[PDB]
Design a protein around this ligand. Structure first.
Ligand SMILES: OC[C@@H]1[C@@H](O)[C@H](O)[C@@H](O)[C@@H]2N[C@H]12
Ligand SMILES: O=C([O-])C(=O)[O-]
Length: 780
């Protein structure tokens, strides 16, 4: 029995008193609200909110049976007796409390009939998680395939078909029950921790996500090199082996930006050395030279680190002496068994642990290390009587990796303020993206099932803040011999997902350079294609920094009024323009692609398809996976380079997919120095825009550049524009009012300024794109 007793406003927040205690409501923006129950009591702070203290001005009104607290899109409606808060966008009901808050921590809400619920972070259960119940406890799932209710990186959040996001702002061992136990009840639970939730609303999925990342944190632009080719295995055993691998990329003519070193960099065995956090000199005798020698070839070095210091490690006595480790309740360093051996866990929640760990990252970063891999932050083993500075293991568990990232991010920004940190981690919390976190999906099995789950995982993480979620390309766990077809399919799909990092246990090679002749002839041009497409990918990255828009988008974005599309986890958008359908079984001879209504082109073959709703059937081959381009797309390319350190946009090649069904289209290309964390804030960029206007008798392109530019920015780019599906009736072109004839022969064989290829239906324009506006007009 809960009822309203009294309220007041203090500092823009509404504090309500019931018979059971105090409740604080603060709008964190016009469409986001933090609801803190037990507000009177001391509890852990918010982890999910980028600005925990903020509270924007809201409107309060009172009636007999209700209060109403409104931010301008989001309204909280507070029923007095019995006490129940519900949430409205306009006057559409988003979400209503059932019994709401109780005791242990427990929140109960009604689900509407037909409401679909995405969320939970990494699970393999189906896109719509309604009807499921699962824990909120980050945990390894070694060798997963086609099913999981619990893995490395859960999120205590959901996204509904009613276009709200709900966050349980609580770091503790808990559970979510999405209308499983009771069909119309969403229940959130925890053993302890903060008793708060956050509701975010939107008028569309993009703007929900913009609103969500507004209050939880925007990912800062990673360094362009994170969009490149990684060499990684578990693991290079020696400096010789690592140098031989960088060399193999060179001698095999595969692009390579970054080599990743796993745990053998600090000791010769898997067990017993962890916490050394220093070079194993018997096997890495000259590491500063190694890294400098690699940097001369434009290659970065990334090192694995972990939260555990073993008692067998060289740093045990020192970590104990500095009070860097988590303690038992008695006050001693807590030691426990891990796979790796007997050890403790660095307390990133304390000042002492944070300083000690940070000093180590500083020193290695001074030596040459460009980036950082933080493995096992679930934490992988975390006994319940472990005590951190702010709470026990079960209370802080799901926020450990999150704070680890914060610690490392701040440290790297402090040491290198002119560089963008690279932080790759296995576990975090809502908002960990504001510390640069780049998550991967853990120890996936080397099976088709492992590959077939990657899109579901990626989309689930992308929707709730994590743009750079990716997989171990080719698969990681077990196997006894390479499954060549699965490997190829996985590295194909790789091109069209966020981070190009094949990784696997080293009894089978993960790196494409170590594959047979057929596999390399298939994958070499695709890895090059990933580099030629950097303008497309880096521009989606820019948009993610700006608005939260994930790089991978689900099919369901294509039609917000068709909730059945929510179930699709086999076709997705890579940026605005490409609909990708990975092949996830052996021997598949054709696919049916549920392309939205409109016009689509085969990316590889240029074939044009129109569809009014029905799916398209495309045949498959071993050299590609099915990718369709949306009519009206501008696909930008630069020439392939070995390393993003050599990246230039002096030469652009842009492909426009014309169709009269799209009378107006746009694209952009975001260019900056690829490394400056302040490029966007300070406008040190070159933002190229392109607008096509397509009428019955003309096709008009308007080109422009904004921003203040950056150092090394080309003033003039040689630009080849290729118009696919171009009309054969264009007689003339003018460029900024100057008329040029269109050639109809020998387009591939003359330095033609405008040439129509009648066999391919492509019109090619070659011109100089300088700083001033440019207008290209084709007319029949
Ligand atoms: O460090 C060894 C190895 C690493 O290669 C994987 O990527 C991790 O998820 C897991 N900890 C196991
Ligand atoms: O699209 C056009 O304008 C045509 O096909 O001739």
């Amino acid at each position: 029995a809960v009822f309203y007793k009294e309220h007041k406003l203090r500092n823009d927040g509404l504090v309500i008193t019931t018979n059971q205690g105090n409740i604080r409501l603060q709008f964190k923006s016009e469409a986001a609200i933090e609801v803190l129950y037990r507000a009177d009591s001391k509890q852990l702070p918010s982890f999910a909110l980028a600005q925990p203290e903020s509270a924007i001005k809201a409107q309060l009104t009172e009636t007999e049976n209700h209060l109403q607290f409104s931010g301008g899109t989001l309204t909280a409606r507070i029923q007095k007796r019995p006490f129940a808060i519900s949430y409205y966008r306009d006057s559409e009901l988003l979400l209503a409390e059932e019994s709401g808050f109780q005791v242990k921590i427990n929140f109960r809400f009604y689900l509407s009939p037909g409401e679909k619920i995405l969320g939970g972070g990494q699970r393999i259960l189906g896109m719509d998680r309604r009807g499921q119940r699962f824990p909120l406890y980050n945990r390894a799932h070694y060798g997963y395939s086609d099913h999981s209710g619990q893995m490395y990186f859960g999120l205590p959040a959901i996204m509904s078909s009613k276009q709200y996001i709900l966050v349980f702002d609580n770091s503790a061992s808990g559970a979510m029950d999405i209308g499983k136990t009771e069909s119309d009840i969403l229940q959130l639970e925890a053993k302890s921790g903060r008793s708060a939730y956050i509701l975010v609303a939107g008028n569309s999925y993009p703007s929900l996500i913009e609103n969500f990342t507004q209050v939880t944190g925007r990912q800062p632009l990673p360094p362009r090199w994170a969009l490149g080719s990684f060499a990684s295995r578990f693991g290079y055993r020696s400096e010789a082996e690592t140098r031989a691998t960088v060399q193999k990329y060179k001698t095999e003519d595969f692009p390579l930006d970054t080599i990743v070193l796993d745990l053998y960099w600090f000791g010769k065995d898997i067990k017993g050395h962890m916490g050394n956090l220093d070079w194993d000199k018997e096997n890495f005798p000259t590491p500063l030279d190694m890294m400098a020698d690699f940097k001369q070839q434009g290659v970065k070095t990334v090192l694995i680190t972990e939260p555990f210091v073993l008692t067998s490690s060289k740093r045990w006595d020192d970590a104990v002496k500095a009070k860097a480790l988590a303690k038992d309740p008695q006050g001693q360093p807590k030691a426990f068994e891990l796979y790796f051996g007997n050890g403790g866990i660095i307390d990133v929640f304390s000042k002492e642990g944070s300083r000690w760990f940070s000093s180590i990252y500083k020193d290695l970063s001074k030596q040459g290390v460009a980036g950082w891999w933080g493995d096992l932050g679930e934490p992988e083993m975390h006994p319940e009587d472990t005590q951190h500075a702010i709470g026990d293991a079960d209370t802080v568990h799901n926020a450990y990796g999150h704070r680890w990232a914060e610690m490392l991010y701040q440290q790297q920004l402090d040491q290198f303020p002119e560089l963008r940190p690279f932080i790759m981690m296995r576990a975090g919390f809502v908002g960990s993206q504001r510390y640069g976190m780049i998550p991967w999906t853990g120890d996936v099995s080397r099976t088709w099932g492992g590959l077939a789950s990657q899109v579901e995982l990626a989309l689930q993480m992308s929707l709730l803040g994590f743009g750079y979620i990716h997989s171990d390309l080719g698969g990681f766990a077990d196997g006894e011999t390479l499954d060549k077809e699965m490997y190829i399919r996985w590295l194909q799909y790789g091109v069209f997902q966020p981070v190009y990092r094949p990784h696997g246990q080293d009894h089978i090679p993960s790196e494409p350079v170590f594959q047979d002749e057929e596999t390399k002839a298939i994958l070499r041009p695709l890895v090059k294609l990933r580099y030629r497409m950097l303008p497309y990918i880096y521009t989606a990255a820019y948009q993610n920094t700006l608005t939260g828009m994930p790089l991978m988008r689900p099919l369901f974005f294509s039609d917000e009024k068709n909730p059945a599309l929510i179930d699709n986890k086999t076709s997705y958008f890579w940026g605005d323009s490409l609909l990708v359908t990975p092949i996830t079984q052996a021997g598949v001879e054709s696919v049916s692609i549920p392309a939205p209504k409109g016009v689509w082109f085969d990316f590889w073959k240029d074939t044009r398809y129109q569809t009014d709703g029905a799916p398209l059937t495309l045949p498959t081959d071993l050299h590609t996976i099915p990718v369709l381009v949306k009519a009206g797309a501008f696909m930008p390319y630069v020439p392939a380079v070995s390393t993003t350190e050599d990246y230039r946009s002096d030469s652009l090649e842009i492909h426009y997919y014309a169709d009269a069904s799209v009378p107006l289209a746009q694209g952009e290309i975001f260019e900056d120095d690829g490394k400056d964390p302040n490029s966007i804030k300070r406008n040190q960029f070159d933002l190229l825009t392109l607008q096509a206007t397509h009428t019955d008798n003309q096709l008009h392109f308007q080109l422009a550049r904004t921003g203040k530019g950056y150092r090394g920015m080309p003033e003039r780019r040689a630009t080849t524009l290729v118009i696919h599906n171009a009309s054969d009736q264009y007689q003339h072109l003018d460029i900024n009012g100057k008329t040029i004839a269109i050639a109809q022969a020998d387009c591939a064989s003359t330095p033609a300024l405008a040439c129509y290829d009648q066999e391919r239906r492509q019109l090619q324009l070659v011109f100089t794109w300088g700083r001033e506006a440019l207008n290209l007009r084709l007319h029949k």
